[PDB]
Write a structure and sequence with these properties.
The complex is a heterotetramer, with two copies of chain A and two copies of chain B. Chain A is α/β, with parallel strands linked by helices. Chain A contains 29 helices and 15 strands. The longest helix of chain A is centred in the C-terminal third of the chain and has 29 residues, at 477-505. The two termini of chain A are 30 Å apart. Chain B has a single domain (1-275), classed as Ribonucleotide Reductase, subunit A. In chain B, 74% of the residues lie in helices and 0% in strands. Classes of the chains: A alpha/beta, B mainly alpha. The structure holds adenosine-5'-triphosphate (2 copies), thymidine-5'-triphosphate, magnesium ion (2 copies) and manganese (II) ion (4 copies). Residues 51, 54, 82, 86, 179, 183 of chain B line the site of one manganese (II) ion (MN). Chains A, D: Pfam families: Ribonuc_red_lgC, Ribonuc_red_lgN, RNR_N.
């Protein structure tokens, strides 16, 4: 066993009844003085390194050609001047195993952390040396972390796409289904997770040109997509991951759910395609009143009204659907469907739950389209227009397929540096650059939506780490007050940066004029309610930083009205799974699953303590499963009120609790304004 | 939660000895050295003898004490495979490769062999100790059964898989691979039945059952090391066989819901080439806060 | 002189209910009267109970006490067929034709039906009375098993055969014919084992064993008459079924090496109407013509 | 039990030790007196019938509008003047259950046999009343039978395409694979059987964008295609049928074959995807000499030579591939592979066998392309060019995808009417019309090849029926003499009609000038070898008909040289599954499987004796399984020497014969010039 492995395992060997957390630090030293420094490839100077990486097809030469070598040297020197040290063994291990650039045979390390950060910063700046240094300082301080696609692939010749998630709308036609399968394979080839809205597809037993009971429903398309994602599995490196979203009022909703039952037959079971359910407020109202609900056949509704079932408001059209004899429907028990959802989530963690009305009551771009589904991580909530892929030799009507670039603020590092504004603006600029340089040649709706919406996702990580390292319980009202203030600041500065980009470029996102940003409605709660901290401890935490007031929000509203906004969507809180290790941060705004996690790598086992875990903050690092899910819902709703897109909200459940407890948590989330629920992980 | 699924997997894996023609093995058998032929014969007899105990006692005794019609049916199916399919398959392999007198002598030798007998009698002892309506004694026997299915067979399976991965004795190697695939599912299934009993116990009783399982594993493992050297030193393979035993011991433990005992090791590439939460109705007022 | 040929016959008869698609019976089932459907469900439920106990208890226990690995392999295979194939097939039929509540009700009905409980009590009692190394207790259980295989099933088999012969419920009927084909060979085989034990006895002992067999048959027969009337009076067939069970009682006696006990009668002619490839290598001469 | 069914089951009841065959005739009468006439919709006049069928969207207005009502009435009167009577119950049952037009509620019969024949004739003639009457006389004499798609769908508004055999070339790219899946779905939606060539696809473990061990091979593509064919199943009417062809020198050939093994796992086996193997002469030579063969990685060959492995002649390329270090290959035993093919055919009848050199040594259009694969029925053998389907908003390079037009001559009816020439020419005209009226808007290469090649398949059926009713054993040399003469006349008149159409329209098929028809090579064996019958009995059979001599063939060769040929391909012998029942004929040129076949429809049993079966010809109606497969191969080769495309050739084996016998039959077929082997049906 390696020396650093033994040093890391020495953490759990208690001394005087206490964990040896400091041993972890020793491990990193070993991991660098025995493996990383020996396995790294050193050159005489930076010029030889850059030339070797360029000619050997490791780096794209275009982004490096925008800078003179003196500027690149200055950027690299700025990166190395911080003398960044990984405080935990797992941070360095995760970076050098998942994100550091290696040779073709993967026998040596070509990229250090500073080298990777410098390359990403130079790609972000697009020829601006000062901007590149700003990005270097932002990432080496670990205030901002680009998503895994962006951080791993920026400036690389053998790179994939920098966009993490893609959302596709599938129209009810064989041509559209085949095009959706093709685009899903193309985007999984690019490495991104693909989500498909199957609510427009007509249910099982519908007519294909006057011959009835002909359609296979959404389950056949689900099987096709599952095989497509199995085939396109990132060249066999990462399993192809897809998501299917169906409205709960679709007739196939049961069969949909039956794809995830552990007793499902092979002709129905789907195993590589995640499932999500979109629940309008009408379904929750029907379940609450115990009135029997009706699921609908989408094609009959489309024939009668000319629009898809998910294209209009069910809260106002459900009674018209039910009373219409030309609309076909089936009777269901909404409470039984809710119990089935809870049982499925207990068994397998599926489906994702999207509360459609919670998303669309604060959605700023309802004029473009209502949000009808979410992404594979159930945090992207954007307007999408379905595409009409016609026959060959016929022009296709290209719609809008959602796609946003992810980037997370490290809350602990951002607040320690007292740089919410600067970090938010620089992250917005980096995400705007990632969107601008993204061009996908096989997904036309994705390309058009990227060019028009200009949507980005700016997330946050290390919420629980910051709260526990500052002596604040994650479930406490003080923690929710901090989240309210911090994310109001993040939203304020993201809107300010979006408006500044719109002013400097003279262009807004497409159809911005009909948005609530243009009409000023979006700023209502910000121009009437003060989001400054209500607790003295939180206010002290925010000292040295100008917390925006109602007057600052009014000025920002006027600025947006004058100049517009460059981005249709700005903030989305992704799960941030593996890149949180490198940043020494807790995953996303979720509470920690465990204080010390035991992970098996190779034939060895390693223990990763939570960042900053110690004796004095052991009980502030409360495990998520031990927490009240209602207070976690309260925290997520408090954050969500300042996030325009959704938050990947994983439910952390105990084995003792029943499906009724899961249903109660889901209904409280819906009541509190939670937009989406990601996972039901049971301990 | 699992018996109907295992029923399906078991019955769809049904096969018969006659399906594989064995005679073409003589074209590679004739080219093996005396030590290779000797080891193969001894390993084969070891597997045969252990599998007979499982068919005559192990599976039928567990089927007798387990409650549930569907479980009894699956267990009956597994017992059938031992007696009607596996036993005939081993006999067929022997009759193809050795003359009658050689078969009788190998079985005489392996029947007297100290390391084969030690493990065979240890397992049989636990089957004989099951008491009516005593789930603790049943669990102990299930542990023994899982150890046989998922662990003890593998010091033996190594050699046919080693040849099979090299292009030698392909017909008998195909048969062995089918047998092994059955024993794998048998081990997993009996493992789930043992975990069901284990989970019904107190914390102190659980700790006591864990100690039993680890102690038993240790006794069997130390004898396997001796068994291994006794058979494989003459063909220079013992080091690699030992890695394969530990890897399969870990699988057996995982079948019983226990943590792996041994560190992870890589396996010989030639052998590799051969190889519900409680539903509670919504009571209303759960929609109001 | 016979086990090997029974082994081969049993394994070549292997089948699963899923091989037969049952949705074709949906309409002829829908068309039967409520009385007819009730009798049909109950008849198959009575059969399910018999096969449940034959698979769980009867065949495994006889296998335990009979000497010889090949004899045990045949008996183990027959046991598997009883509970893993036969008993399960009835559920396939039930799940196709009947709603869950009707299925639940018929299984509740078997538990409380006095004739079905009596026949199970009597047969299983004899199985559980077998004493190790006591050939007489074993003979008695084998007689009971032959009576189950070759006599007791037939009050149940009558009705699926009666429909099959009229071109009704033919998919379910195909399953039943496969079950019947199996039981016929099971009854012969167990009969031959019983005769082996009987033939070892003194003339005085033989006389007592015949008394046992005939007394048991009469006791089972009298109970079966009441069971038959209870099921078939509502469909008007009790007298016809009674003739059929007497016919089959004689076959059971014959399987035991005894003379027929009931006089011959005309059976309903409808019911009578209700009744890998070898591989060679390619030679160099096969490429030229 | 209905009266006609009792009269049909009375056949098996033997009177005086003989089957009551004549009772079948009575059954037909009952089937018309009790059922057909009662459930046939009658109208006061044909005008009312046509108006009702057109208005209720049963027929098409376009093809009926080309004639005055007087001409349509005259065509219908010509059809009804024959007073055609079905000679067997199964003929009428199959027509009125499969082909007769029924109401939307499927309880009444709108079309009789004469009505359907008249409608198909009017569709064929395209406005010519005399041509329509000629077609009516052709089909009511039952001399020619349009295929099931053409016969069922001609003149019907609610219909699929008239072509049901489609051959697709799949290029080695994700875009091309997705396009192939889409086209397969679209063509299965149209009701056609789709065959895909997977030899150009790179094998498992190949590089994608210079990353190693990334390709899933052709098995993942087969899984995708199998899912696509399961999804597209003719609106839930028939099971989606597809075929995949792989060259035997493709490395995936074993895994390909492993998709049909019973022991294959669920992630390996494809259930609704037929498989065929293309066997070049090089593989047969390697197996014959027992030399170990090499299966090649297609992408390495493409990188080294710039052409696909299946696009070059393996006979001259195999040694260069083996000796090339940059071509990756795996060692195999060709005799073991042949034994595996025989074993798989014994178990399941798969794969289809295509002898590439047997096809291409007589292929007339090798300049366009060599025949690389066959159809789902393994009788279509045409040149195909792969298409380069690029990314979106990029022009695709459309190639040639085979789609031939099926139609079968009834040899008994054709020869008893002494009308080989007239029937062949009229069938060629009808096939040309159906090919010209086919327009598929979702298969670009299929449409392009239909427009360019103008390929049709004119088959024959009732060969064994005709031979048995004339006292000729199917295995006798007289039967082969008759087949030789009859199919040489069929080829002569097909070529003459193609040249006449080319002269009339002034156009040939694309790239005809490079064909062997243009160079006169095709006619070589016809201008030197006389194909007149060598037996007096066969000559008396051909009495009253002019048999083309060598001088006639020289004149035809000169005519083709002067005027060209309209069709790239003319003759292909399809299995003719259900149309053989309606025509009261034996299926294809195959020998009969059973003298009397027992079928189960609903809960009733039915008995179909072979046409013309009696006590006198009971011995001549020998069953196919009892026949010597070598003599069946000899007859099929005798026919194949006059057929430009292939013949659906099913092997009929007994359970006693082993895989050595199957391999011997396959090797004798290869030796005798058999192009394709369809199925290995074991009795
Ligand atoms: N935790 C760590 N994170 C990142 N790099 C590390 C870490 N520990 C060691 N290294 C690398 O290994 C080298 C070993 O030097 P070490 O940290 O022991 O101190 P040093 O030799 O006094 O110099 P310095 O600390 O100034 O780099 C470091 O210079 C650095 O490049
Ligand atoms: N074998 C058959 N094939 C086809 N149609 C038949 C057959 N037998 C009877 N029919 C149909 O039933 C009708 C009655 O025919 P039948 O044998 O009674 O005498 P017919 O002289 O042909 O009668 P019609 O006055 O109808 O012409 C036929 O006209 C035809 O439409
Ligand atoms: C072709 C086909 C379609 N479908 C379903 C899936 C699609 O969502 C739906 C629409 O198919 P379409 O491609 O729209 O078929 P269509 O346009 O010819 O019919 P229509 O005019 O009614 O739109 O039909 C199947 O389920 N199976 C099939 O094989
Ligand atoms: Mg449509
Ligand atoms: Mg390519
Ligand atoms: Mn075994
Ligand atoms: Mn076993
Ligand atoms: Mn039984
Ligand atoms: Mn039995």
């Amino acid at each position: 066993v390696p020396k650093w492995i033994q040093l890391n395992n020495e953490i759990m060997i208690q001394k005087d009844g206490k964990f040896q957390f400091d041993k972890d630090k020793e491990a990193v030293h070993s991991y660098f003085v025995d493996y990383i420094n020996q396995n790294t490839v050193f050159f005489h100077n930076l010029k030889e390194k850059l030339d070797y990486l360029v000619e050997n097809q490791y780096y794209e030469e275009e982004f490096l050609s925008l800078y003179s070598f003196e500027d690149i040297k200055e950027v690299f020197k700025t990166a190395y001047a911080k003398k960044f040290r990984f405080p935990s063994f797992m941070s360095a291990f995760k970076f050098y195993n998942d994100y550091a650039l290696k040779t073709n045979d993967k026998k040596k390390i070509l990229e250090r952390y500073e080298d990777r950060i410098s390359i990403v910063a130079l790609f972000f700046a697009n020829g601006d040396t000062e901007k590149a240094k700003e990005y270097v300082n932002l990432m080496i301080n670990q205030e901002y972390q680009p998503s895994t696609p962006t951080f791993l692939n920026a400036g690389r010749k053998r790179r994939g796409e920098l966009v993490s998630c893609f959302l596709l709308e599938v129209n009810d036609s064989l041509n559209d289904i085949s095009r959706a399968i093709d685009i899903s394979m193309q985007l999984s080839k690019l490495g991104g997770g693909v989500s498909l809205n199957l609510s427009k597809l007509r249910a099982k037993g519908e007519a294909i040109k006057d011959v009835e009971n002909a359609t296979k429903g959404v389950v056949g398309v689900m099987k096709l997509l599952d095989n497509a994602f199995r085939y396109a599995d990132q060249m066999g490196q990462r399993q192809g991951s897809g998501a299917a979203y169906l409205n709960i009022f679709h007739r196939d909703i049961n069969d949909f759910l039956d794809t995830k039952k552990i007793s499902a037959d092979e002709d129905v079971r789907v195993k590589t395609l995640s499932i999500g359910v979109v629940i309008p407020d009408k379904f929750v109202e029907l379940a609450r009143e115990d009135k029997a609900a009706y699921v609908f056949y989408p094609h009959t509704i489309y024939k009668e009204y000319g629009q898809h079932m998910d294209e209009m408001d069910m809260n106002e059209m459900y009674d018209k659907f039910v009373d219409n004899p030309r609309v076909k429907k089936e009777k269901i028990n909404p409470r039984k469907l809710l119990e089935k959802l809870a049982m499925l989530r207990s068994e397998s963690g599926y489906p994702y739950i999207m509360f459609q009305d919670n998303v669309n009551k604060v959605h700023a771009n309802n004029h473009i389209s209502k949000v009808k589904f979410s992404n594979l991580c159930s945090e992207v909530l954007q307007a999408s227009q379905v595409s009409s892929y016609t026959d060959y030799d016929e022009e296709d009507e290209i719609g809008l397929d959602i796609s946003c670039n992810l980037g997370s603020l490290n809350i602990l590092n951002v607040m320690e540096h007292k740089s919410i504004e600067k970090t938010v603006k620089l992250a917005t600029d980096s995400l705007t650059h990632v969107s601008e340089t993204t061009d996908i040649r096989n997904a036309p709706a994705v390309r058009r939506a990227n060019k028009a919406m200009k949507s980005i996702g700016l997330g946050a990580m290390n919420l629980h780490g910051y709260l526990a390292q500052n002596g604040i319980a994650y479930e406490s009202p003080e923690a929710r007050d901090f989240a309210n203030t911090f994310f109001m600041m993040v939203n304020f500065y993201s809107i300010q940066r979006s408006a500044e980009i719109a002013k400097e470029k003279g262009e807004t996102f497409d159809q911005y004029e009909g948005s609530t940003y243009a009409t000023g409605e979006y700023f209502d709660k910000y121009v009437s309610t003060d989001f400054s901290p209500k607790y003295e401890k939180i206010a002290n935490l925010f000292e040295g930083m100008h917390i925006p007031t109602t007057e600052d929000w009014k000025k920002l509203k006027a600025f947006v009205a004058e100049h517009g906004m460059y981005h249709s969507y700005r903030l989305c809180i992704a799960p941030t799974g593996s890149i949180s290790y490198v940043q020494s941060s807790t995953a996303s705004v979720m509470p920690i699953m465990e204080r010390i996690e035991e992970r098996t790598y190779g034939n060895s086992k390693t223990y990763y303590p939570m960042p900053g875990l110690a004796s004095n903050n052991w009980f502030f690092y409360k495990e998520a499963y031990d927490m009240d899910m209602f207070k976690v819902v309260d925290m997520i709703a408090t954050i969500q009120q300042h996030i325009d897109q959704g938050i990947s909200f994983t439910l952390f459940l105990k084995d003792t609790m029943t499906t009724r407890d899961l249903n109660r948590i889901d209904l409280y989330a819906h009541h509190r304004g939670i937009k989406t629920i990601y996972y039901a992980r049971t301990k | 939660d699992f018996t109907q699924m295992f029923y399906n997997q078991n019955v769809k894996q049904f096969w018969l000895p006659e399906e594989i023609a064995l005679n073409g093995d003589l074209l590679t058998w004739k080219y093996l050295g005396k030590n290779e032929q000797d080891t193969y014969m001894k390993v084969l007899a070891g597997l045969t003898l252990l599998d007979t105990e499982q068919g005559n006692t192990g599976m039928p005794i567990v089927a007798e004490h387990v409650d549930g019609h569907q479980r009894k049916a699956v267990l009956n199916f597994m017992a059938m495979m031992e007696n009607a399919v596996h036993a005939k398959s081993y006999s067929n392999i022997f009759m193809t490769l050795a003359p009658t007198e050689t078969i009788n002598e190998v079985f005489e030798w392996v029947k007297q062999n100290k390391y084969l007998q030690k493990k065979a009698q240890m397992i049989v002892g636990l089957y004989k100790a099951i008491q009516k309506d005593d789930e603790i004694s049943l669990f102990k026997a299930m542990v023994a059964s899982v150890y046989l299915e998922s662990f003890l067979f593998y010091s033996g399976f190594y050699y046919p898989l080693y040849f099979y991965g090299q292009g030698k004795l392909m017909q008998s190697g195909e048969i062995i691979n089918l047998i092994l695939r059955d024993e794998a599912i048998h081990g997993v299934y009996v493992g789930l039945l043992a975990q069901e009993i284990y989970n019904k116990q107190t914390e102190e009783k659980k700790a006591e059952l864990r100690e039993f399982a680890i102690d038993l594993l240790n006794q069997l493992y130390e004898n396997e090391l001796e068994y291994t050297e006794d058979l494989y030193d003459q063909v220079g393979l013992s080091h690699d066989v030992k890695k394969f035993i530990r890897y399969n011991a870990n699988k057996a433990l995982m079948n019983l819901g226990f943590d792996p005992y041994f560190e992870e090791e890589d396996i010989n590439p030639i052998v590799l080439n051969g190889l519900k939460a409680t539903v509670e109705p919504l009571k209303d007022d759960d929609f109001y806060f």
